[PDB]
């Protein structure tokens, strides 16, 4: 069984999640939407095109009457149009980041850390925790993140499923969903991600490293206690490998975000702080 120190750890993480994750997105109310009836510089525009072509999503808005507005983005012509979704996604990301900051704030182990390490941990893990929360609303049968009345649908092409697996962020979401994790495993993953001692700017490397290990030990014990099936022999290491992949996707997304921001400013004030944009 789990130790009571461990059962309480999970209880505090789960209460934090319940209080700070708007799973129905019912309080995401104000956001921008794409309009209705709307040398080195050129090399930078080229790379950003290849960044933005990596993830093609359509936006679905479902009304309370059952009607649906579907937005299909334009195909890459010669500029501007490739950015039509960026305001909306900035508002969506900023909304999610506020939720992650609120999650970290209610964790005892986080509040007790020096504030500049709190800031450093959040700047390094914000995208990762948002993606972990996004995985819980990912419908792998429809390739859709179901965000209440909003839905983000992967645009299906000629290659089908195997084409989507070419994008590391997409392969991440499919592979994690297949692990069929419980809410408790998800929230422990978020804690291990948040308390990464190796983020830039963390001074108390040893304290965070020790806390990260206690979350990892609690995750290992939870799996042993509630999933005794020999089918889950390596589940814990499989989760950890997903976290290693999330760090690589985090680095690539940061680099991509920065390039897009250079040629077309979109980041909200909170995003600017999280990503180091002046």
């Amino acid at each position: 069984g789990l130790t009571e120190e461990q059962r309480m750890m999970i209880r505090e993480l789960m209460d934090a999640q319940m209080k700070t994750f708007d799973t129905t997105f019912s309080h995401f109310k104000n956001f921008r939407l794409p309009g209705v009836l709307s040398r080195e510089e050129a090399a930078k525009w080229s790379q950003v095109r290849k960044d933005l072509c990596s993830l093609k999503v359509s936006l679905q808005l479902r009304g309370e009457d059952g009607s649906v507005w579907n937005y299909k983005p334009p195909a890459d012509s010669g500029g501007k149009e490739i950015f039509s979704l960026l305001p909306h996604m900035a508002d969506m990301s900023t909304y999610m980041f506020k939720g992650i900051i609120s999650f970290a704030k209610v964790i005892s182990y986080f509040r007790d850390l020096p504030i500049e390490d709190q800031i450093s941990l959040l700047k390094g893990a914000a995208f990762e925790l948002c993606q972990l929360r996004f995985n819980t609303v990912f419908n792998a049968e429809t390739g859709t993140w179901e965000c209440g009345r909003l839905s983000y649908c992967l645009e299906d092409t000629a290659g089908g499923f195997q084409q989507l697996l070419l994008e590391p962020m997409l392969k991440f979401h499919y592979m994690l969903k297949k692990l069929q994790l419980h809410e408790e495993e998800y929230v422990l993953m978020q804690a291990i991600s948040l308390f990464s001692p190796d983020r830039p700017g963390v001074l108390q490397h040893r304290v965070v490293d020790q806390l990260q290990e206690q979350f990892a030990i609690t995750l290992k014990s939870y799996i042993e206690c509630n999933r005794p099936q020999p089918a889950h022999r390596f589940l814990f290491l499989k989760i950890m490998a997903m976290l290693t992949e999330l760090r690589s996707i985090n680095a690539q997304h940061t680099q991509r975000l920065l390039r897009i921001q250079d040629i077309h400013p979109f980041a909200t004030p909170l995003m600017q702080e999280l990503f180091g944009i002046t």
């Binding site: 900051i101 504030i115 800031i119 702080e273």
Partner: peptide, 13 residues
């Protein structure tokens, strides 16, 4: 001052 919004969000209850 580089993290004014983060500081405020962490301070609020």
């Amino acid at each position: 001052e580089r993290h004014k919004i983060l500081h405020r969000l962490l301070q609020e209850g």
